Every structure is written in structure tokens, then in C-alpha cells.
Design a protein around this ligand. Structure first.
Ligand SMILES: *CCC(=O)N(C)c1cc(Oc2ccccc2OCCn2ccc(=O)[nH]c2=O)c(C)c2cc(C#N)ccc12
Lengths: 401, 547
């Protein structure tokens, strides 16, 4: 009911980002939504004296046919002054279950600072560039802007105060328009409790981190080894020696002496067996000197393994993985690589939000033009991370399979 | 007098920290001074400008070419940024046919849109005096001046706000704003159409704006931005390829301009050689001799540009189709249409700059470009007709290390067909010979060696001059492909060669890579295995090629 003064970082002008083309159905959906929001006073039309712009598109979230308006506030978010902070709940990842709730509507009840509104300008584009587009700006806290959860934090604490006083065993976290609620109850009790919290919020996504663990490097167990099996084993161990110091391969490479056929069975000498067992024992231990630094970026790498299987690693320093995983879920994307990749990026970003409270920068195994052409067709989250594109096939792919 | 509705003004500021213009006025001749005094007297009588006093310290020069012209370049440098008047140029193929299309001249409204009063002081200008024996006449603009940075955008937004309720209450028509002209199309009867045109003239007159009762000068066919617009079709303005005994750089840039421009409706235009001649020139007057390939290409262009071709307008009730054909040397052509033999438009795609490539990647990129263009022009993705078998695409994307996707498409049997030229095995081949390859070079003398040893005792080492490590590794793999049977296992330690081959190219800048590809095409089964170097892996002989 009272506006808080908001400004930009010193020396930085407002965002001026090109609007990308939208299909006719998304444009119509945005016209409907924005007409309603203008009736409700959430947005207002602007004139040509506003040169700023932020891209906008439309999506359809899970289990819903209603269109939703998504704004890409990435540029504005990095150009908005730093708001201050709350330490990340380190116990949220340790909890048995976590449920994600969309609390973005509440933000619309708090007015936005006057002089800042011009920086939230967005454009509904026209087909074939017949007009310069329908231009709007926000009057309330917009969804997707990093200042909205920071400004609403006091109100959110006031609303969640009775529930947090009632259940001290439930962990509550907030990121952008999302509220993460972690507990250890049963799925039914968790759902009834989630309905209790949603009706508690009204009058004012099953996720199980306990079923997630870090993935170690495993070596094959065979009774007969071919030259090719041993060559791949030596390659994988040589790669793993960059992570684990004491990995030794000379006794296994000793067997590869001579120009033998790749499919020729080679028996393991005793020294080779002992070396392989020592390597297994080394690989069973965690990585030496692996820590998180809140001042550094998080890097996520994704490898396509085929048959709907994907691998990923989150790290900050090379060979110092903070998280590793394998997403093989199949959900209406059996014939579409890009949809699978986009769902994988959303899941990895969600996990990273739960663990560290911020999003990682992805290295996507896809051409820039394909990804930028199709990723908004399968996006369902309210946030958007940063990404880059790897054009050279990494050799380590099969070493994560 | 009927009360005229006031037009809301746009608040305008200067760029932060900057100040208004203060430019010295050029001395003018007595004749020019008299002319500007008359013109400014009439304009003051109309209300476009107003006389000011000596308190105003700002000044913008004035000229006469009479006609009064004010040079606002300094004030433009000092004026705030505005939202663009356009985010692109409409394409004629996106227009939807109408029974009637009327043009209305709203040019008189340009000087009738008021300017923000707090900003008017920055538009001050001075007329010099005769013999400069009196103080010059001081004026400032009250409306949007022609040549000022913010005039087109403010004029367009004002016109849009005025036209909004008329367009809302008349959905059976289409109103489009372009510069100082309004274009109104409709499928109603000609009498009803002219009637609603009169209604629009009245609605505009309620703000005092005047549309000429005189019949407008523009009429079919409309000539606009190098285009011809007809009641039932569109095309480009006539493209004439001149006959030149010799061609310079500006003639080749004019020709590639005419060909890139003509390629949007004339199918099959090729610009590869003619634009290749302009590679790394940067000299406008340099005369460049024409290769024979440029002569074949140019002759094909003159054959395509012989007789006129037209495109049709968009019908949303019909499907949107885009067919692609390969042309060679990284050139691709495409037609977008809704009915067979009647194209909406055409176009081309040239491959990006790269060291290695294959046809499937290029077709993918072309599909993405056509998809984006289609969403721009028509707001939907077209159904594609591609010269590639379904099984080929499935093998490709299922085996490709990158994620890739093509929207709904169907196969069309129009050679040349995009195919996969080789496929490496997933497991080692039983019964096939195993070639351990290696290569090495000296960084100073550039001398190297490349070769292989096999499980059957076969060996070869070849010495090389003026080579590198990467070259000797590729050369080793090439030697293994040369001297082996139809099925072969190959073992290398070259992360470079594996990086190249796992990208699956069918064409390359390097002739050595192209030779390796040509060898891979002739094989039945090839399994490529990588091992770490210098790890004492027998067979992999680094010392055999370092001698
Ligand atoms: C605002 C005008 C504009 O942006 N453009 C590109 C533009 C359009 C145009 O044609 C139309 C104007 C209003 C409604 C519908 C159309 O076109 C529908 C297809 N069509 C075109 C031409 C015709 O004779 N019949 C028809 O059905 C025109 C004519 C022009 C003209 C000019 C000029 N000079 C500039 C931009 C135009």
C-alpha cells in the first residue's frame, strides 16, 4: 500500500531488448491477458517516450489449458540494484519432500515505485510488423522481476508467520514467484498440508530430494576382457585421474602391449586385478577439497546419451563436481530432442534452486539457432537461466554413461 | 465553430546531463531572408510557431532551399531516445487480399499535433535581419517540426490513439498507418466501403484533421519499397541485369543487391560466386575479373529473370507449405506457398562459415530460418517438404550427439536428396583388421611421420614435409583407410581427429579431411576407437613416428 524507492545500478541505463517473433495464438493470448490486466490496473499503456523494452511470450503450465504470460526479465534483473540478505536454508535439500507453489498473484497487490515503472516496459508484437506493437508498463510488482520477492519479503513473513509458528518442522523457502515447502510427512499428509497452506494463503509438484544422491564413477565387472574393453577402461581411468589423484593405469596398460585384435580376449594378470581394485577403492571415496563459493557462478553441463537419457554435472571449478545426475524421464517428448533438453534444463535449474538458492549457467549440446527457435515452446517455469552453446562433441560423454 | 478535440501531448525530455542546442546562425542573403520572413509569417498565422523574446538562449540554424528547412541535427543529438516507429518492414506476402483498398492523405495532420510546451523552448530559431542592423526574428515551434528526432513516433502514436475507437467499432475493415498516409481495406461492397471511408474522414475531422476531398494521387499498382502491389498479386519492381563488358566492385554489389532482392519471389537465384568475388576486397573502384562459375551462375540468373513472376497474398483459411531444394556449394532454395504453382514467396539460404559441415545440418538451419521468417510474416510455422527420407532423418537425430528437431514435415522425392554418407559402428568389428595409427611432427623443421601397425603384421610409416601434429594424425587415419578392406577397426590417440569425425562431416575446407571422408564412403564397416597417448598402450606406437 506504500511504494518502496527502487533504482538501477550506477551508470546503467534501463533494458532495451528486442522482442522476438511470436505465433498468432500466443499474440492473441497476450492481448486477452493484457486487456484483463489493464482493466485491473496492473499494467498501463505507454507512449513513444518510453524507449525501454523487455521480451514477453506466453506458455501453458502443467495440467492447465489456460495461457500464462511470461516475461524475460533477465536483463532488467541483472541491471537492477542488488537487494539485501537471507542465508539459504541448507536443510531444504535434506528434507524428504518439497512442494513448489506459484505465489506470483500476491505480487500484484503491491504497487510499484513510480519512477521505476518505465523500466518494466514490454511490447506485444504485431504479425508482419504492421504496427510498432502494443506497449505496456507495470504499475505493481511484476512476476519474474528479482525486486518483487525482495519487496514482498516482509508481507510474506507476516502471512507465513502463523503457519511457521504452527509447524517448526516444515522448511519454507522463496525464490522469484515460487515457494518451496519441505517436510518429512507422508504423501497424503503432505498433500493435505499443502492444501492447508494454500487455503491459508488464499484468505490473505511432488519433489523428493531424499531420493536424490550424487553419482560415483563405476568401473565394469567382467570375467573376460577384450582389448577394446581394456582400452576403454584405461581411457576412463585416465580421465578419472584428473579428479582422483591416486588413479594408476600402468599395470592395465601393460596388458595392451602388442598389436592385438580389438575383440581378442585378454586375461588379467594379478597386478592388473590389484590395480583395478585399488582404483575401485579410490573411486568409492568422495572428491578431495570440494566446496561451494557463493561468489562464483554455477556451471551445468548436459550430455545427450540417447534413448531419452541425459546426464548432467553441476560444478564451479573443473573436475570439482558439486552435483551429478541422470535425467531419463519420458513425458510426451519421445520424438523431440529439444523438448527433452528443455525439460532437463528446467529440472536441473529447480534442483540448483533447492540446493544453492540460485540458477546455474548451462552449456547446452545444441546449435544456437535450433535452441533459440524452439525452447519457448516447451518452457513451463517462471524463471529463466543463462545458457551457452557447445559446438564440439565432448569426449567425456560415454565416461558419464 | 465546432469544438475541436485536443490531442494529448507527449512529455519529452533531453538526454540526461545534456543541455539544449546553442548553434550559431549562418548569415543569409537578403532574398533568402525575405523569403523566410514571409514563410514564417504565414506559419505564425497558422499557429505552427510563435515569436519569443531574448530570454530564450537556445538556437537552431535555419535555411532556405522558397522552402524553409531547419537543421535539427544538434537537438537530435541532445533529444531523448524514443520507441521505434517500426520494428521491421512488412512483407507483401503477409498482406491479406481485400475487395477495396483506399488511400487517405493525412499529411496536414503532421503540423497539427502539438509539441510538449516544456520542450518548445529547445526548438528556438532566429531569422537574420536585413544587413543585421536589427535583432533577428526569434521563433519557437508549437508542433512537431519536420526533421526533429521525435516527430514520426509521436505522430504515429497520436494517430493510433485517435484511430483506436474507430477501428474497434468497425472490425469489418482494416486500417493501417504508414508515414502520412492511411490505408483502409475491406471486403464490403464498394458503396459500403466508400461510406465507411467517409465515416473515417469525419471521425478524423472531429480532431480538426483534414483529409483531401481531391482524389488521392496513389493508385494501382502501388509502388512501395521496391515492390509492386496489385489488387490480386504482388511482385518486385522490375529487376534488370545490365550487360557489362567488364564489371567493377560497385557493379557486382549492385548485381548482388538486385539478385538478393529478386530472390524473394524469383525461385532459384544464386549469389555464391558473384558475392565470392567480393571477398576481402574493401575497394569500391577495383575491377575484378569474373570467373567462369560466376558466368554460369549469372547466365542461370538471366534465364530465371527473363519474364515476370508474381506472388499471391495470404489466405489464413489455407495451410502454409514450405518446400526446400539443395543447390550445391552450401546453397539452398525454398518456396513458401498455399496452393501448388502459386507461391506466396521464395528465398535462399547459404551455409554459415565453418571448417566442416554436412547437408543435414544445413537443411536443419534452413528449416529454422524459414520457420522464423514464417512466424514473422504469417504468425505460424509452415508444413515442410524436405528432400530427405524419414529413415535418414531418424537415423541422424537418434545418433547425433547434439539435440536437434525439425517441425512437422514430409518427404518429397526431388534430387539431390540429403543422405547420410557414412555411419561409424558402435562396437568393434569381429574378423576385421585392427589398425593402430599415429602421427607426429617437429615444431621447428615441420617434418613429421604418419603410419600404422596392425594385428596381422601390416605396417607403414610415411615421412612428411611441411606438416603439423594434427595433419600427421589425420594422415595416419587416412593411410589406415587406404590400405584396409571393407571392414576395419581403427585405433588412434588423436582427440583432434576424433573431434572432427564425431562431428560427421561430408565436406571440409581441409582436403585431407575430404580424402578421409571419401575413404569412409567406400567402406562397409568402420569402428573408430580412441585411446590415451603416452600411456604405454601397446600397438599405439608414438616412438615409431617420432624417429
Ligand atoms: C500501413 C500500410 C503498410 O504498412 N503497408 C505495407 C502497405 C499495405 C498496402 O495494402 C493494404 C493496405 C490496407 C489493407 C490491406 C492491404 O493489402 C491487402 C492486399 N492488397 C494490396 C494491394 C491492393 O491493391 N489490394 C490488396 O488486396 C498498401 C496498398 C501499401 C501501399 C503503399 C504505397 N504507396 C505503402 C504501404 C502499403
Amino acid at each position: 500500500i506504500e511504494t518502496v524507492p527502487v533504482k538501477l545500478k550506477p551508470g546503467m541505463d534501463g533494458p532495451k531488448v528486442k522482442q522476438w517473433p511470436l505465433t498468432e495464438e500466443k499474440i492473441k493470448a497476450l492481448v486477452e491477458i493484457c486487456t484483463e490486466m489493464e482493466k485491473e490496473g496492473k499494467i498501463s499503456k505507454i507512449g513513444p517516450e518510453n524507449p525501454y523494452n523487455t521480451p514477453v511470450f506466453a506458455i501453458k503450465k502443467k495440467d492447465s489449458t489456460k495461457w500464462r504470460k511470461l516475461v524475460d526479465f533477465r536483463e532488467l534483473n541483472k541491471r537492477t540494484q542488488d537487494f539485501w540478505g537471507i542465508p539459504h536454508p541448507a536443510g531444504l535439500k535434506k528434507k524428504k519432500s518439497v512442494t513448489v507453489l506459484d505465489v506470483g498473484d500476491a505480487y500484484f497487490s503491491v504497487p510499484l515505485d513510480e519512477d521505476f515503472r518505465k523500466y518494466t516496459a514490454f511490447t506485444i508484437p504485431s504479425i508482419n510488423n504492421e504496427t510498432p506493437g502494443i506497449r505496456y508498463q507495470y504499475n505493481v510488482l511484476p512476476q519474474g522481476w528479482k525486486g518483487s520477492p525482495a519487496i514482498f519479503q516482509s508481507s510474506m513473513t507476516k502471512i507465513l508467520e502463523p503457519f511457521k509458528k504452527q509447524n517448526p518442522d516444515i522448511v519454507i523457502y522463496q525464490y522469484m514467484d515460487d515457494l518451496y515447502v519441505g517436510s518429512d510427512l507422508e504423501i497424503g499428509q503432505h498433500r493435505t498440508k499443502i492444501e492447508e497452506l494454500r487455503q491459508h494463503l488464499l484468505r490473505w509438484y511432488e519433489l523428493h530430494p531424499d531420493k536424490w544422491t550424487v553419482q560415483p564413477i563405476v568401473l565394469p565387472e567382467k570375467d573376460s576382457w577384450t582389448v577394446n574393453d581394456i582400452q576403454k577402461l584405461v581411457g576412463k581411468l585416465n580421465w578419472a585421474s584428473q579428479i582422483y589423484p591416486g588413479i594408476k593405469v600402468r599395470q592395465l596398460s601393460k596388458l595392451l602391449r602388442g598389436t592385438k585384435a580389438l575383440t581378442e580376449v585378454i586375461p588379467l594378470t594379478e597386478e592388473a586385478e590389484l590395480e583395478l581394485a585399488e582404483n575401485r577403492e579410490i573411486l568409492k571415496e568422495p572428491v578431495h577439497g570440494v566446496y561451494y563459493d557463493p561468489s562464483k557462478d554455477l556451471i551445468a553441463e548436459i550430455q545427450k546419451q540417447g534413448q531419452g537419457q541425459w546426464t548432467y554435472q553441476i560444478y564451479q571449478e573443473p573436475f570439482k563436481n558439486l552435483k551429478t545426475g541422470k535425467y531419463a524421464r519420458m513425458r510426451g517428448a519421445h520424438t523431440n530432442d529439444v523438448k527433452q533438453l528443455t525439460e532437463a534444463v528446467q529440472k536441473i535449474t529447480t534442483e540448483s534452486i533447492v540446493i544453492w538458492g540460485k540458477t546455474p549457467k548451462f552449456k547446452l549440446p545444441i546449435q544456437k539457432e535450433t535452441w533459440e527457435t524452439w525452447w519457448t515452446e516447451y518452457w513451463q517455469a517462471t524463471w529463466i537461466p543463462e545458457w551457452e552453446f557447445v559446438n564440439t562433441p565432448p569426449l567425456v560423454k560415454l565416461w558419464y554413461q | 465553430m465546432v469544438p475541436i478535440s485536443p490531442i494529448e501531448t507527449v512529455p519529452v525530455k533531453l538526454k540526461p546531463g545534456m543541455d539544449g542546442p546553442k548553434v550559431k546562425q549562418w548569415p543569409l542573403t537578403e532574398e533568402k531572408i525575405k523569403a523566410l520572413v514571409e514563410i514564417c509569417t504565414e506559419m505564425e498565422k497558422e499557429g505552427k510557431i510563435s515569436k519569443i523574446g531574448p530570454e530564450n538562449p537556445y538556437n537552431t540554424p535555419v535555411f532556405a532551399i522558397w522552402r524553409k528547412l531547419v537543421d535539427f541535427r544538434e537537438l537530435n543529438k541532445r533529444t531523448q531516445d524514443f520507441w521505434e516507429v517500426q520494428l521491421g518492414i512488412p512483407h507483401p506476402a503477409g498482406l491479406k487480399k481485400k475487395k477495396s483498398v483506399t488511400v487517405l492523405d493525412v499529411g496536414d495532420a503532421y503540423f497539427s499535433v502539438p509539441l510538449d510546451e516544456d520542450f518548445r523552448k529547445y526548438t528556438a530559431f532566429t531569422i537574420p535581419s536585413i544587413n543585421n542592423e536589427t535583432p533577428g526574428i526569434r521563433y519557437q515551434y508549437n508542433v512537431l517540426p519536420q526533421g526533429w528526432k521525435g516527430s514520426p513516433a509521436i505522430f504515429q502514436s497520436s494517430m493510433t490513439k485517435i484511430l483506436e475507437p474507430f477501428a474497434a467499432q468497425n472490425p469489418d475493415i482494416v486500417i493501417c498507418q504508414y508515414m502520412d498516409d492511411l490505408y483502409v481495406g475491406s471486403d464490403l461492397e464498394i458503396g459500403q466501403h466508400r461510406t465507411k471511408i467517409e465515416e473515417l474522414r469525419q471521425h478524423l475531422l472531429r480532431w480538426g484533421l483534414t483529409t483531401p476531398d481531391k482524389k488521392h494521387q496513389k493508385e494501382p499498382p502501388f509502388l512501395w519499397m521496391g515492390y509492386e502491389l496489385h489488387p490480386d498479386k504482388w511482385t518486385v519492381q522490375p529487376i534488370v541485369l545490365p550487360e557489362k563488358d567488364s564489371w567493377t566492385v560497385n557493379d557486382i554489389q549492385k548485381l548482388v543487391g538486385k539478385l538478393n532482392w529478386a530472390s524473394q519471389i524469383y525461385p532459384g537465384i544464386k549469389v555464391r560466386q558473384l558475392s565470392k568475388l567480393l571477398r576481402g576486397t574493401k575497394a569500391l573502384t577495383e575491377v575484378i575479373p569474373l570467373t567462369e562459375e560466376a558466368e554460369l551462375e549469372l547466365a542461370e540468373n538471366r534465364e530465371i529473370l527473363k519474364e515476370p513472376v508474381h506472388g499471391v497474398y495470404y489466405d489464413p483459411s489455407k495451410d502454409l507449405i514450405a518446400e526446400i531444394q539443395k543447390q550445391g556449394q552450401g546453397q539452398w532454395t525454398y518456396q513458401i506457398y498455399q496452393e501448388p504453382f502459386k507461391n506466396l514467396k521464395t528465398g535462399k539460404y547459404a551455409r554459415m562459415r565453418g571448417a566442416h559441415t554436412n547437408d543435414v545440418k544445413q537443411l536443419t538451419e534452413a528449416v529454422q530460418k524459414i520457420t522464423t521468417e514464417s512466424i514473422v510474416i504469417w504468425g505460424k510455422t509452415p508444413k515442410f517438404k524436405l528432400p530427405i527420407q524419414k529413415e535418414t532423418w531418424e537415423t541422424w537425430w537418434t545418433e547425433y550427439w547434439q539435440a536437434t528437431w525439425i517441425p512437422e514435415w514430409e518427404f518429397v522425392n526431388t534430387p539431390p536428396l540429403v543422405k547420410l554418407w557414412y555411419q561409424l559402428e558402435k562396437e568393434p568389428i569381429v574378423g576385421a583388421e585392427t589398425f593402430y595409427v599415429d602421427g607426429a611432427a617437429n615444431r621447428e623443421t615441420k617434418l613429421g611421420k604418419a603410419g600404422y601397425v596392425t594385428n596381422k603384421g601390416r605396417q607403414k610409416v610415411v615421412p612428411l614435409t611441411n606438416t603439423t601434429n594434427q595433419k600427421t594424425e589425420l594422415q595416419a587415419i587416412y593411410l589406415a583407410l587406404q590400405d584396409s578392406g571393407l571392414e576395419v577397426n581403427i585405433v588412434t590417440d588423436s582427440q583432434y581427429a576424433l573431434g572432427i569425425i564425431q562431428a560427421q562431416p561430408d565436406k571440409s575446407e581441409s582436403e585431407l579431411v575430404n580424402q578421409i571422408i571419401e575413404q569412409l564412403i567406400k567402406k562397409e564397416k568402420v569402428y573408430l576407437a580412441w585411446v590415451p597417448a603416452h600411456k604405454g598402450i601397446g600397438g599405439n606406437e608414438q616412438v615409431d613416428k617420432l624417429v
